[PDB]
């Protein structure tokens, strides 16, 4: 029941839309272990409507695709263009005018190698 309240609060953060699947919830009956099993099929459904909300607006699969194997390195044509510009600059530690140029080179290396979805690749920031 703890994890039930955790998933219903996630959908509540979006908006106030969920209802318990029965019109009235009773546990004051001699059967009680079949009622926590209809509690478990309830938080499974709350997972399914959260998995809904992942697949509709949020695109968790496209977010993990845009990060992970691309973060190891998947499409190096984004990065070998940026690796042309790691050999001219990255010889000494960063100065005060250097990290302004590094974000200018990441965004330059974005569109020379034709990214397919631009709001999934503007979330990249640069460590000092």
């Amino acid at each position: 029941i703890l994890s039930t309240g955790k998933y219903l609060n996630v959908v509540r953060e979006c908006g106030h839309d969920v209802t318990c699947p029965d019109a009235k919830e009773i546990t004051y009956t001699l059967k009680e272990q079949a009622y926590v099993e209809r509690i478990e099929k309830a938080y499974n459904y709350a997972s399914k409507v959260l998995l809904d909300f992942l697949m509709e607006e949020e695109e968790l699969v496209a977010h993990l695709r845009s990060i992970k194997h691309y973060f190891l390195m998947d499409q190096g044509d984004f990065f070998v263009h940026f690796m042309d510009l790691t050999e001219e600059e990255l010889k000494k530690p960063v100065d005060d005018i250097i990290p302004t140029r590094l974000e200018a080179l990441l965004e330059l290396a974005l569109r020379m190698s034709t990214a397919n979805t631009d709001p999934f690749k503007d979330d990249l920031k640069i460590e000092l």
């Binding site: 590094l102 974000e103 080179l105 990441l106 965004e107 569109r111 503007d122």
Partner: peptide
């Protein structure tokens, strides 16, 4: 224009 400074970022790396 949110990436026009990003295009000028990549200029110094190639020279």
């Amino acid at each position: 224009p949110t990436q026009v400074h990003k295009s000028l970022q990549r200029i110094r790396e190639r020279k």
